[PDB]
Amino acid sequence: GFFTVASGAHASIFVIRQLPTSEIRHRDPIIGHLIWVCIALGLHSFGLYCHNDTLEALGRPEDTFCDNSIQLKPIFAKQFLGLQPGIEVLDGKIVRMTQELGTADFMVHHIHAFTIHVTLLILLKGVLYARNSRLVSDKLELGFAYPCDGPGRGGTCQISPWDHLFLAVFWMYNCLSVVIFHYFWKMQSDVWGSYVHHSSLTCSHYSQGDFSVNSITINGWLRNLLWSEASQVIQSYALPSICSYGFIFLAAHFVWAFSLMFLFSGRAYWQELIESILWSHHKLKIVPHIQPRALSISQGRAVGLTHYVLGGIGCTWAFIISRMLVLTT
Amino acid sequence: PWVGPKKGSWVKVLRPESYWYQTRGQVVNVNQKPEIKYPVTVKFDRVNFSNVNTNGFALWEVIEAPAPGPGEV
Numbered sequence: 145g146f147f148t149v150a151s152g153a154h155a156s157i158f159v160i161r162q163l164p165t166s167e168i169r170h171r172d173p174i175i176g177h178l179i180w181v182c183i184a185l186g187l188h189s190f191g192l193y194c195h196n197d198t199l200e201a202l203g204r205p206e207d208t209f210c211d212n213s214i215q216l217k218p219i220f221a222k223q224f225l226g227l228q229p230g231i232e233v234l235d236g237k238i239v240r241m242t243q244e245l246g247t248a249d250f251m252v253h254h255i256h257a258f259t260i261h262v263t264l265l266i267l268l269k270g271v272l273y274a275r276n277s278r279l280v281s282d283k284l285e286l287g288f289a290y291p292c293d294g295p296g297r298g299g300t301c302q303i304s305p306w307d308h309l310f311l312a313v314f315w316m317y318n319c320l321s322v323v324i325f326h327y328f329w330k331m332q333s334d335v336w337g338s339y340v341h342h343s344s345l346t347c348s349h350y351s352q353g354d355f356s357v358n359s360i361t362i363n364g365w366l367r368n369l370l371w372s373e374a375s376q377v378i379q380s381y382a383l384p385s386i387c388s389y390g391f392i393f394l395a396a397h398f399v400w401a402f403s404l405m406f407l408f409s410g411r412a413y414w415q416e417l418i419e420s421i422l423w424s425h426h427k428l429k430i431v432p433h434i435q436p437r438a439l440s441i442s443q444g445r446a447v448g449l450t451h452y453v454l455g456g457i458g459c460t461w462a463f464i465i466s467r468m469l470v471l472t473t
Numbered sequence: 474p475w476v477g478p479k480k481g482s483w484v485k486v487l488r489p490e491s492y493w494y495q496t497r498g499q500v501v502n503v504n505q506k507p508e509i510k511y512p513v514t515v516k517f518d519r520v521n522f523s524n525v526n527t528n529g530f531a532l533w534e535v536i537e538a539p540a541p542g543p544g545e546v
């Protein structure tokens with residue numbers, strides 16, 4: 145994900161510094177159709193989850209999208225290995241097992257496609273509209289990394305390719321978090337675990353195969369994956385092995401929240417606060433000749449993005465690693 | 474004769490909207506033309522938010538002050 149957003153960034157830089165290719169001359173249809181496909185994908189894919197949530201809450205499981213109810217079979221997801229029936233085991237563990245795809249896999253894969261397409265939309269818009277646009281016609285003169293062009297024309301905030309990356313990084317992080325959660329839950333529920341005894345084995349999975357039944361709802365994701373599987377990391381303080389992981393969980397939550405400061409606030413408030421503070425220093429004759437300044441707009445965005453991504457990644461890192469370490473030992 | 478402060482002398486800026494309001498700068502020059510509304514030119518060691526070091530002030534927006542001491546603006 146990080147290197148893909150990087151490729152988008154440096155594509156934008158190349159467009160700014162050099163002449164672009166001729167596919168930029170019909171950029172409006174390209175980005176328009178990408179916008180439409182993003183909207184349609186998000187609507188359908190996420191609204192299936194929302195429909196499942198609402199109907200299940202109302203008490204109508206027969207109306208939801210699931211294997212027992214209306215089912216969205218992934219017809220195109222076909223085997224190619226041609227493996228023999230069964231699973232491969234090694235000393236009380238399942239080294240290899242076929243992943244069986246159903247409505248949950250259909251829904252999660254289309255969520256993946258939606259998020260990938262939205263990230264691609266942000267990156268491609270930044271690349272194609274880097275030199276100029278209907279809003280501002282001298283974006284090339286403005287450069288690559290500028291905060292805006294002004295409050296004019298309604299407001300030209302984050303029109304630069306740098307800001308387009310600044311948003312595409314958020315979207316890449318969202319996509320990768322969903323991918324990580326999908327992989328983690330699916331592997332725990334349907335692949336990993338132990339077995340209990342031509343011989344037939346009953347496979348006891350770590351998550352107990354709850355992905356196919358609970359993953360069909362956002363509430364199921366919230367309960368069976370985050371809340372239920374955060375027991376290890378949340379209750380890791382006394383345990384010698386993973387107390388560090390619990391503390392890092394807490395600290396990553398703190399850092400992620402602290403990023404919202406920079407992501408929501410603006411330069412002028414902090415500059416005025418700094419001046420008011422500096423009044424007292426000048427009063428007491430503490431005169432810093434490297435005059436304090438509030439972080440620039442682009443720097444504030446960068447700091448917020450860095451802290452946001454780092455905190456989220458740290459929370460996920462600690463959560464998954466604590467769960468795995470405890471379960472395997 | 475010299476209408477404004479002497480060249481090189483320190484003057485305290487009395488323009489309320491100035492970044493250097495109530496602080497002192499050095500009189501770079503004074504325009505002797507009577508038709509100049511803001512003849513005095515004052516430079517300050519502290520650049521304002523626009524990274525500007527000097528400015529023009531009227532004769533009533535600057536008063537003569539001693540040179541800043543240690544730790545004084």
Ligand code: CLA
Nearest residue numbers: 172173174175176177178179180181182183184185187188
């Ligand atoms: C005159 C109404 C009208 C018409 C004919 C269209 C037509 C179109 N819109 Mg839509 N659109 C509308 C209003 C309309 N829009 C409004 C008000 C908004 C702002 C929220 C949008 C926002 C919007 C976006 C963001 C996008 C489209 C897109 C599209 C195109 C594909 C269809 C689609 O997915 O629409 C989905 C959106 C709709 C609003 C559906 C159309 C609305 C119908 C005609 C409503 C008719 C019934 C109405 C609810 C009755 C209420 C009566 C009551 C008050 C008494 C198509 C050219 C997509 C596109 O360009 O694809 C290439 C696209 O990306 N539209």
Ligand code: CLA
Nearest residue numbers: 181184185217218219220221245249250251253254257258
């Ligand atoms: C909107 C875009 C979109 C995107 C990004 C994806 C993404 C994905 N789909 Mg597909 N899918 C789509 C639409 C889309 N789908 C639609 C509309 C349907 C019909 C309900 C399906 C039905 C479907 C199934 C059943 C499966 C996938 C699967 C997949 C995966 C790729 C492998 C595959 O078999 O693709 C197949 C892709 C298609 C069948 C869609 C063909 C491309 C579009 C629809 C052509 C339309 C163009 C047309 C000529 C003009 C339309 C004009 C307009 C005005 C109406 C991936 C997660 C597989 C997977 O991994 O599931 C877990 C899988 O099993 N999709």
Ligand code: CLA
Nearest residue numbers: 255321322365366370371374378397400456457459460463
């Ligand atoms: C005050 C309440 C509070 C607050 C403010 C937070 C804040 C946070 N938690 Mg949470 N958390 C809480 C309570 C809270 N938590 C409690 C009580 C627990 C139980 C101990 C946890 C356990 C926990 C874990 C184990 C994790 C978090 C994560 C996070 C971070 C999310 C960052 C982000 O952008 O995610 C963006 C949000 C998402 C990606 C959605 C995740 C959850 C939904 C249900 C997934 C749905 C998937 C489905 C397919 C649909 C996807 C649609 C797609 C288009 C996105 C953030 C620091 C996670 C994180 O870092 O996320 C990356 C993480 O690892 N928390």
Ligand SMILES: CC1=C(/C=C/C(C)=C/C=C/C(C)=C/C=C/C=C(C)/C=C/C=C(C)/C=C/C2=C(C)CCCC2(C)C)C(C)(C)CCC1
Nearest residue numbers: 147148149150151152153154155156224263264267268271
């Ligand atoms: C630079 C750039 C970027 C990025 C990009 C990217 C990220 C790319 C990627 C790319 C890629 C990564 C590609 C790949 C491709 C692939 C291929 C081409 C393959 C295919 C396959 C095949 C052909 C197969 C088939 C089959 C079937 C179907 C069945 C059975 C048999 C077989 C196996 C044969 C962005 C937008 C950001 C910005 C601008 C610039």
Ligand SMILES: CC1=C(C/C=C(\C)CCC[C@H](C)CCC[C@H](C)CCCC(C)C)C(=O)c2ccccc2C1=O
Nearest residue numbers: 405406407409410411414415437438439440441444445
């Ligand atoms: C808080 C904030 C500021 C003010 C923040 C500033 C000036 C940062 C302060 C920089 C310090 C001096 C760097 C030194 C590093 C930290 C003090 C390290 C602390 C480490 C702890 C573990 C102790 C802005 O200027 C700003 C600008 C634009 C958008 C958002 C914001 C914004 O959110």
